[PDB]
Ligand binder design. Structure first.
Ligand code: HEM
Ligand SMILES: COCCCCCCCCCCCC(=O)O
Ligand SMILES: *[C@@H]1O[C@H](CO)[C@@H](O)[C@H](O)[C@H]1NC(C)=O
Ligand SMILES: *[C@@H]1O[C@H](CO)[C@@H](O)[C@H](O)[C@H]1NC(C)=O
Ligand SMILES: *[C@@H]1O[C@H](CO)[C@@H](O)[C@H](O)[C@H]1NC(C)=O
Ligand SMILES: *[C@@H]1O[C@H](CO)[C@@H](O)[C@H](O)[C@H]1NC(C)=O
Ligand SMILES: *[C@@H]1O[C@H](CO)[C@@H](O)[C@H](O)[C@H]1NC(C)=O
Ligand SMILES: [Cl-]
Ligand SMILES: [Mg+2]
Length: 325
């Protein structure tokens, strides 16, 4: 279906309401590395089994959290192109599942949001790097480090100052312990944006002060659960304030080269100075590598989803056509 449009009414409102109660997981229910999508599934804004269409995901992030339209479209279609089933139009917000339908041929993985190196990546705040065995479950030790950074830099609350310090700490921990640490292109951009999301979207919209308390933080990050009487943000937003996070500790994109403490800058990677290059490489390299010679029905589904992806790209970039027009 077409990408949904922006909210007709984007006011703050109760989103933890009678029609969207929190429910525990049933056997087979899928939760993944994103506490935003996990919470919408656990409140019934998304299907509770954690398998959804792109249009369902865009509608849920807007209705439940007031995520802005352009960001919703870009992230949803990027995730769907690399992790979703383009024929059935279904994406798992977590582990690979037969529930997304019959698979395309390799090398396409349709691995859900849990698939390492497509969307999900290293130096997550409350999830471990895939090298350590689990890139998707809430990690109590990592969350306690988020609390400690909130106590030291946020007076007990998570804010953009905390995000700047913790983002850099998680990069330095990955450099020191993960010999396969990768921090380039798509992951380089999304890792910085994700650290603003709690301050911009998990803060009750009646305050919208960018100060997230640790009870609310645990409720979202561990339990996929809105605080009692949670109001969504009072206007559409996503990564507002990412400039503060970067400015705290500016980093070049790069990777460890098979050893710890070997972080090597990648001059071929995009960075914040080349945002159009990030889009071009995502399409010409990442998507194309998963579908190099697609059959007629797959080509048509790719071209449709790539057009939808381009709707979320900031004005100024040129659309690229890996399968022709
Ligand atoms: C619009 C579609 C969305 C998609 C496809 C999506 C997908 C993802 C994925 C795959 C990750 C894991 C990346 C990683 O850390 O390795 C992630 C992280 C995250 N997402 Fe989402 N996301 C979306 C929207 C949102 C929204 C609306 C929120 C908040 C309301 C949110 C909050 C977060 C946070 C806080 C993290 C970082 C988790 C951590 O580092 O511990 N996301 N997202
Ligand atoms: C800096 O964090 C990035 C997280 C993305 C959140 C806002 C997505 C907005 C989509 C425009 C992207 C333009 C482009 O890709 O060239
Ligand atoms: C929009 O929704 C809010 C809160 O749900 C409501 O109070 C407000 O009156 C609505 N605006 C319009 C134009 O209906
Ligand atoms: C190691 O890094 C490569 C890309 O550089 C990635 O494709 C692979 O999945 C990574 N594996 C783990 C578990 O970190
Ligand atoms: C959580 O993260 C810590 C710190 O990286 C790690 O040592 C531990 O094995 C991870 N997993 C669990 C289940 O705690
Ligand atoms: C984070 O909280 C601390 C302590 O209240 C404060 O000094 C800092 O200005 C806050 N940062 C932001 C961006 O709100
Ligand atoms: C992407 O491919 C198009 C041709 O299809 C080309 O114009 C563009 O330069 C490519 N960009 C990159 C970064 O490879
Ligand atoms: Cl919007
Ligand atoms: Mg990760």
């Amino acid at each position: 279906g077409l990408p949904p449009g922006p909210l007709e009414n984007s006011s703050a409102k109760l989103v933890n309401d009678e029609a969207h109660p929190w429910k525990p997981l049933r056997p087979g229910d899928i939760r993944g590395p994103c506490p935003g999508l996990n919470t919408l599934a656990s409140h019934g804004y998304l299907p509770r089994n954690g398998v959804a269409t792109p249009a369902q995901i865009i509608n849920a992030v807007q209705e439940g959290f007031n995520f802005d339209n352009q960001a919703a479209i870009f992230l949803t279609y990027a995730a769907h192109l690399v992790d979703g089933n383009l024929i059935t139009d279904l994406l798992s917000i977590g582990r690979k599942t037969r529930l997304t339908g019959p698979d395309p041929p390799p090398p396409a993985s349709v691995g859900g949001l849990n698939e390492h190196g497509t969307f999900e990546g290293d130096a997550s705040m409350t999830r471990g790097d895939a090298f350590f065995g689990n890139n998707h479950d809430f990690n109590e030790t990592l969350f306690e480090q988020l609390v400690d950074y909130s106590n030291r830099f946020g007076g007990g609350k998570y804010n953009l100052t905390v995000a700047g310090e913790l983002r850099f700490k998680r990069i330095q921990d990955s450099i020191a312990t993960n010999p396969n640490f990768s921090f380039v292109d798509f992951r380089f951009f999304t890792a910085y944006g994700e650290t603003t999301f709690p301050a911009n979207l998990f803060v009750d919209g009646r305050r919208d002060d960018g100060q997230l308390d640790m009870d609310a933080a645990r409720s979202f990050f561990q339990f996929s659960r809105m605080p009692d009487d949670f109001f969504r943000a009072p206007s559409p937003r996503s990564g507002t304030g990412v400039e503060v996070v970067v400015q705290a500790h500016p980093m070049q994109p790069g990777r460890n080269v098979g050893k710890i403490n070997s972080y090597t800058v990648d001059p071929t990677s995009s960075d914040f100075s080349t945002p159009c290059l990030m889009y071009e490489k995502f399409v010409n390299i990442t998507v194309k590598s998963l579908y190099p010679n697609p059959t007629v029905q797959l080509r048509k589904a790719l071209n449709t989803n790539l057009d939808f992806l381009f709707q979320g790209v900031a004005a100024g970039c040129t659309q690229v056509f890996p399968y022709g027009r």
